[PDB]
UniProtKB/Swiss-Prot annotation:
Protein name: Ferredoxin-1
Name of the gene this protein is made from: petF
2Fe-2S ferredoxin-type domain residues: 3-93
CDD domains associated with the record: fer2
InterPro entries hit by this protein: 2Fe-2S_ferredoxin-like_sf, 2Fe-2S_ferredoxin-type, 2Fe2S_fd_BS, Beta-grasp_dom_sf, Fd_pln
Lineage: Bacteria, Bacillati, Cyanobacteriota, Cyanophyceae, Synechococcales
Keywords: 2Fe-2S, Disulfide bond, Electron transport, Iron, Iron-sulfur, Metal-binding, Transport
Residues holding [2Fe-2S] cluster: 39, 44, 47, 77
Species whose genome carries this gene: Synechocystis sp. (strain ATCC 27184 / PCC 6803 / Kazusa)
PROSITE patterns linked to this entry: 2FE2S_FER_1, 2FE2S_FER_2
Annotated family: Belongs to the 2Fe2S plant-type ferredoxin family.
């Protein structure tokens, strides 16, 4: 049951469909979104995306702790958008 996943970017606004048992990144790169990712597995902050218009599940990540997720930075390389959401890519520098 894929849901409308809004991927905000400085080069425009796209909308990819991601499943609950899939990663927002894979669904993005698969379409050609070309998001800021490196490990694309779940062990960084470059894939993190400021979220504040939906919900996701990142119980596989190994970078964030509690303050990061609180802000909204969700690793797209390991996020499970159970429902519609609006991940704001290009939001990792906040940490570094
Ligand atoms: Ga990553």
């Amino acid at each position: 049951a894929s849901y409308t996943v809004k991927l905000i970017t400085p080069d425009g606004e796209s909308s990819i469909e991601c499943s609950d048992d899939t990663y927002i990144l894979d669904a993005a790169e698969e379409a050609g979104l070309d998001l800021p990712y490196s490990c694309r597995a779940g062990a960084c902050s470059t894939c993190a995306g400021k979220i504040t218009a939906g919900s996701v599940d990142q119980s596989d990540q190994s970078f964030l702790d509690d303050d990061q997720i609180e802000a909204g930075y969700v690793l797209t390389c390991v996020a499970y958008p159970t429902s519609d959401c609006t991940i704001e890519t290009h939001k990792e520098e906040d940490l570094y």
